[PDB]
Amino acid sequence: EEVETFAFQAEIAQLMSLIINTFYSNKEIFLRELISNASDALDKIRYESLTDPSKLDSGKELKIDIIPNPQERTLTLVDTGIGMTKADLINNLGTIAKSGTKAFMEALQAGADISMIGQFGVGFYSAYLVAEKVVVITKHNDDEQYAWESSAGGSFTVRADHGEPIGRGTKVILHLKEDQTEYLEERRVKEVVKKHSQFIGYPITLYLEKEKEKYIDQEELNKTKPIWTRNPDDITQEEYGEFYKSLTNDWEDHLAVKHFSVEGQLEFRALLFIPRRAPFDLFENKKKKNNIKLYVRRVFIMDSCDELIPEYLNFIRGVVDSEDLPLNISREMLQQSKILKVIRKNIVKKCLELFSELAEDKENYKKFYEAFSKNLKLGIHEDSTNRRRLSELLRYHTSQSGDEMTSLSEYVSRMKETQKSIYYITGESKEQVANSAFVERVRKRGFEVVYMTEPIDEYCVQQLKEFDGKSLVSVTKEGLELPEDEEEKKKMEESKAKFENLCKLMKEILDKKVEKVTISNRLVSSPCCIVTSTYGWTANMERIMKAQALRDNSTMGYMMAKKHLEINPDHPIVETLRQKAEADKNDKAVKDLVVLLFETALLSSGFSLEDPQTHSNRIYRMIKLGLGIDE
Amino acid sequence: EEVETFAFQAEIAQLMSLIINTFYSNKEIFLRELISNASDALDKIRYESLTDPSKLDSGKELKIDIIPNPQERTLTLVDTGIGMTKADLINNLGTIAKSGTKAFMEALQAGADISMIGQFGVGFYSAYLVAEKVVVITKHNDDEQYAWESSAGGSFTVRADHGEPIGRGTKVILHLKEDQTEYLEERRVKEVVKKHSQFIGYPITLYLEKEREKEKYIDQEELNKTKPIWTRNPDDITQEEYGEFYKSLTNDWEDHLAVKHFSVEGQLEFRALLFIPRRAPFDLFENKKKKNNIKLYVRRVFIMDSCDELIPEYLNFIRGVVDSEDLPLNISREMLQQSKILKVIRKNIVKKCLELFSELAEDKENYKKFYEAFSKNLKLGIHEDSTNRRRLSELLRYHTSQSGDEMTSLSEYVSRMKETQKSIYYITGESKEQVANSAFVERVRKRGFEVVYMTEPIDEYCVQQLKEFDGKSLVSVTKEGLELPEDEEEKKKMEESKAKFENLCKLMKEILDKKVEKVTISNRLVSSPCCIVTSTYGWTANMERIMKAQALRDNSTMGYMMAKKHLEINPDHPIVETLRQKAEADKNDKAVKDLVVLLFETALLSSGFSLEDPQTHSNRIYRMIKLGLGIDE
Amino acid sequence: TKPQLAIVTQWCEGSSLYHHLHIIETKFEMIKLIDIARQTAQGMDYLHAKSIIHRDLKSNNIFLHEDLTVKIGDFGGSILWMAPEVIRMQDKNPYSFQSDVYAFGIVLYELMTGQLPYSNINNRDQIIFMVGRGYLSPDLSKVRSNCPKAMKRLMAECLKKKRDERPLFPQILASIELLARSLPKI
Amino acid sequence: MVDYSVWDHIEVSDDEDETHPNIDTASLFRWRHQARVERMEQFQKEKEELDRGCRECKRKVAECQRKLKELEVAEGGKAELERLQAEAQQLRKEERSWEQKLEEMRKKEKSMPWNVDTLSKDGFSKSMVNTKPEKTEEDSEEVREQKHKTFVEKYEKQIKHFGMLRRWDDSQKYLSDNVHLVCEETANYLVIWCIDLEVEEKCALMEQVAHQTIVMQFILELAKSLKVDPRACFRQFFTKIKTADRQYMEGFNDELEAFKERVRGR
Ligand SMILES: Nc1ncnc2c1ncn2[C@@H]1O[C@H](COP(=O)(O)OP(=O)(O)OP(=O)(O)O)[C@@H](O)[C@H]1O
Ligand SMILES: Nc1ncnc2c1ncn2[C@@H]1O[C@H](COP(=O)(O)OP(=O)(O)OP(=O)(O)O)[C@@H](O)[C@H]1O
């Protein structure tokens, strides 16, 4: 019956220590914070000018300087902004979690051409990460010049001074520490400024001392203006290329460019790119990927391409500038990581549209395809959402087009009336597969076969199983059937009974090895060949799998497929073999001939022999017999 | 002139807004914080009873309870700890950046023997992240029961309460809001507790309502049952306890193989515990899987488990825990700062893991099982690591030409070589039968030397870097210029024979037409007319096969730089002698061309290389079969 | 003069689990038959807690991966995994969690018996009508010699008659785990 | 201030950081997508039903107002009027209930999250192809002479400023802006500069300048082997020579000694 209210308090010393020793990770962002504050002040004075020009009679230009001094340990950062008055100096620079930018934005009309950085409040106390005593000198239009001095303890002193006049800006003098005296070295300052704040709209300059000992004025800290902000109808080709050269350190130019922008609640503006030739360490990974950055009001937030674009589109460079997002207390990470996955969808969609548009003229597509073709087949393997739009940018060599690649949809046009399914073959070279045993029959009836001669082609063709309602059938798998005449079927049925005896005898001599021996219709001018079964690896896949460095072996026996043998019932050699087998049940010559035939069939059908010395000895004996030497 | 001193201030509403929704992700965190406040409280009452009893007449036991209510949307966190008075309900829970744990630790007389979590003073508003109204009921040994209540924003009430007897402790009631009402279930609370804070020293229990046949209440204390082992002395633990911990830390139906347990009591303090799985996981050589093997623990509270540099790449099978006592930590307690101590931890872990590997190599029954599964990961250390190469090469165990089915070692093989020998001989092939009776190792196995077999790709990848052993060099038996130290009488005989086989060299080089760069005569064969060897600088045959077969090659550069080869013949075989005699007379005949092409192609086939166009060879064989049987035409 | 570095692989489609037990022999011990049954129980529990249903789990859908890792999927006669409510023709929405439980029970029967269910009668129309009315069920005597009793209770509970007296997945998972951590041999 | 309560309920259907080790993904994405589309279509059916019901109810309300205006002149209809009043009042109160249900349904479609196609709507988009004539190489002898004179003189001043040093990272950045600027003529003038430094007999300066020059000429010879200009091949040899292995280091040393002997005898 004695409820009594109170008010929330705050403890100051622990608060300051916690801020400046806990909030941030690195010790190099104080320069970013100071540059952001200077940019805001300049923005304020610029906006205030364009109603009465009586506010620019003391200093007409807007600039930013950096002056190191390694004799006194100072890092002065002069600018020419709006300045601060005494009351405002006490009330914003000495009160944690209160910002003077928000008040200026709120009192300002309703809608203006202004966009400033900073709404939290704890940003200037980050100078004490590397500092021992900070001094601020300031002057406004309607006050005098004041000096502010503190040491991150519990008090600050504010006094009027006489000294060197400034026009209307602010000086920030930083007395550096003893073990942090490596920020007066210029390579370090240049690296920090270029990585963090390089798209600021104002001219940062340095004040080095090189060689009388002169006074150098290197302005080159930023001299590449952002180009995605302006209208897309005023940029003329070449202007893009320069921005590409000065973004990633190249000696050449691009090959395509996209400049889209979405609106609504989540809005951004992107400037994707495509390079000319593939970098030679593209799949070396290891190093953190920095091909797509992410900016908020032209200040770096974080870089990544493991969650902004997929892993098979790592060759694309660009910029993803946005306007407002849920940032962290250190503006280095994003709460609600789902926003990134929302961005990724739009980026992928626009990239695919760009590829489709570029594939129109058939003169620049070859340059893009001969250097970026592995990534498309990598994408087909793991992308279920868009595998139909990525299966139309595939070009293949074919045996009705000499030395020009054809497209898959173009294939389906020039088919025959009764043809079903697409035929393909996978090998190791373009001439090893052109003249093989399997092809020599379907290529005599006017049909078509495509040539998939590469290692990743198997990974692709294992996943893509049908195209436009047509099935991809191989020429080397246990009994392909092709449209044919009835009379041929009757003749083949008769021949099957004709050769029904030697077929079993070969199965007798050849033990566990082959699994079933049969007559085939895929050969016209070769004695015999080897085919595999439906559910299991093919020869090429087995060859690739046996050559992987980091992979296990206890599962090899489960996946390999058996092999059948095909006896072609027209070659004279088989005809005489039947003659021999008909009279004699078992002779040494028949055994030797059968073994040698199987062995050459294994050698010509892609398989690797398990003991070459026996085959070599068998060849040497025959060489010796036919040219003399007795033994 | 005039100097004015001031003092710093703050803005309370904006500061609270910053705390609530700027530096806290993964809302679930709130629960952890609350638990970390109960445990600390309990610890205090466990320290005030050591000097004198009779401060425990109110409660005997210590416990942590959770009660969810699905009807009024509340979640209670009863705890029987030290409690809070009235003067401490306004100076501790009503001031940003003010703790009571730190003041407690200050007053101790440097006796240590206590370790409590938290010294920053902002961890109740994490609980404010999920609820809209917070109520606290508290009692102390020398006050009356009091009630705190707040709804955020410049206000809180501290009235007195007479409505319920609590012996001694605290009771926190959260009033959930409509959006986040998934924390009243079983699975969510269970998962959060089991994943974030399960090694706390006290029995967290739960009081959910079940139905059986009917609102009978259930006691499921099993939220934590496994105690932390890594705080005990290493000598006082047995094998079954270690196995049970390993089983109920990564679900598996078998125990471990070896276990390491050490401590580092220097300026840095941490204690680790590493195991070795009995059988390798299936997906341990993937691309970007979320690695979770070594988990950090600062004062028995989970921090992070991914890390970049805690163990190098090849030590992936090792799984266990690492506990510390002090580290530079963020404000969210999920991320490490400035990442310097990690180097020291990684160095120490690598050293002790190698020590364990050497220790396990004494018995000859477990090492076979260890090496049959994790052999590949050692042959990466010789490649990447460069300061531990010397002592990582002893644990390699190859086959040999004198051990039937028994893997020997390099050091054992060094102590079996004859005096004259000055180098190690190895052969890199595809299988063990294909390599057992080849043509290269035919002279070296007749004198009585020893060759070591190497049949796997990672052997090439390692041997390419390991180039010495005990100051002795490894030389292969499939490369150019291999010398066997022998008497100079047979060397003079070879020199005499190197003059009558001279014209044949240039005839063969002319006919093969820039497919072979030399055709010399050499001493490596006894019963084989030809064999092909490669150059001293360049890929061997099997390495080239492996390079070509693999995907993602980027084959623009590699194709036009490698694959040099030679050819060498022997002056004893009848075939070569007959060929020389025949080519002596006529230098433009026809049979000799066919014969030399056949010999070169067969030698190419049985030496590791792959034919460029396999149809021609097959057609030649078929033609000879036809002609030797009388089919003609 | 600029070596290389070993490169990792991506993944591959491991053998289906209907191939292991029907087209090949591939007979495992009793302990591993327990572990597979637990893995399919846990995975279906996760789906069933986000209102996702599956409508079928044919034994070929299960993919016994490298080493030993079960992974349910969807890629696809099959009148042998269907419930006595699916073969009805009313309201076009007979599907619920209990039908998934029934399909899991039939998978368990195939897994520890080693044979196709309903091997006696071979007529598709006859079987569908019989399951419709004059209903039958697989005879439970066809079991392994060393199979435990705790699961024989679980199997009889999964498929009784109706969709109201069938269990939900947490109880099944708990029972399987309890039986698993008590079995040296029996 | 600092209110982030709007970005609390986003939903993605193909999220890859929430999966089970016993479900294959792949098919999980399709299940999630189908569920989202079905729920959206059910709510769309409800909302369109309410909207068209409100539209036809407003049309019927206008018709009833017309009927009331007609009855203002006529008479007789009371039971129909009472039935219409009662039914319309009950329908209007249940429609108010339905409207409140929709007002809460917007908050629920905030709790049931934003999808991909509610957060943003597209604006402008343009795309270009850059059909540039990638064939530009001026006559070999004329480029040799003109580059020799101009570039060789200027970058000879540059290479004289650079050669007195021995540093690597400085050499790395100097070769970076050299491959920005310099060509083979600068390499030839560096060769002749080393040649006439041999005649001047500065042994230590020979060692330093020969170190740098043989590194540059090894870049040159790798360029000759690959026929790729020294502009395009600078970073790989630099990064493999700063991390050069022991064997590569001794090979480089012996080749340095051999080249020094060759030039001294030249
Ligand atoms: N160089 C400067 N010129 C003018 N005003 C300044 C300058 N530096 C700081 N201020 C003032 O300091 C206040 C804000 O200080 P602080 O940097 O702590 O906050 P913030 O602007 O929100 O943060 P941030 O550093 O992220 O931009 C504002 O009133 C701003 O005008
Ligand atoms: N259940 C509790 N029993 C007793 N004291 C408590 C309890 N919960 C909080 N306190 C007290 O609240 C004060 C401030 O706690 P707060 O949560 O703000 O931060 P902390 O204790 O420093 O950190 P943390 O919550 O991470 O352990 C401390 O004096 C602490 O003892």
Numbering used by the authors:
A (entry chain B): 10 to 220, 273 to 692
B (entry chain A): 10 to 222, 273 to 692
C (entry chain K): 521 to 596, 615 to 724
D (entry chain C): 1 to 266
Q: Can you provide the manuscript's text about this entry?
A:
Activation of client protein kinases by the HSP90 molecular chaperone system is affected by phosphorylation at multiple sites on HSP90, the kinase-specific co-chaperone CDC37, and the kinase client itself. Recruitment of kinases to the HSP90 system is mediated by CDC373, which functions as an adaptor able to interact independently with HSP90 and protein kinases and facilitate their association. We have determined the cryoEM structure of an HSP90–CDC37–BRAFV600E complex, and structures of HSP90–CDC37–BRAFV600E with PP5 bound in phosphatase-engaged and phosphatase-autoinhibited conformations.
Consistent with the closed conformation, bound ATP (or ADP-molybdate) is present in the N-terminal domains of both HSP90 molecules. Serine 13, whose phosphorylation and targeted dephosphorylation are critical for client kinase activation by HSP906,7,23, is clearly phosphorylated within the complex and engaged with the side chains of CDC37 residues His33 and Arg36, and Lys406 of HSP90 as previously seen in the cryoEM structure of the HSP90–CDC37–CDK4 complex. Although the complex was formed by co-expression of the full-length proteins, relatively little of the 84 kDa BRAFV600E is visible in the cryoEM volume, with only the C-terminal lobe of the kinase domain being well defined in the map. The polypeptide chain for this segment can be traced into clear features from Thr521 to Ile724, apart from the region corresponding to the ‘activation segment’ connecting the 594-DFG-596 and 621-APE-623 motifs, which is poorly ordered. One consequence of the interaction of CDC37–Trp31 with BRAFV600E is to force the catalytically important DFG motif, into a quite different conformation to that found in the folded active kinase, with the following activation segment containing the oncogenic V600E mutated residue, being disordered.
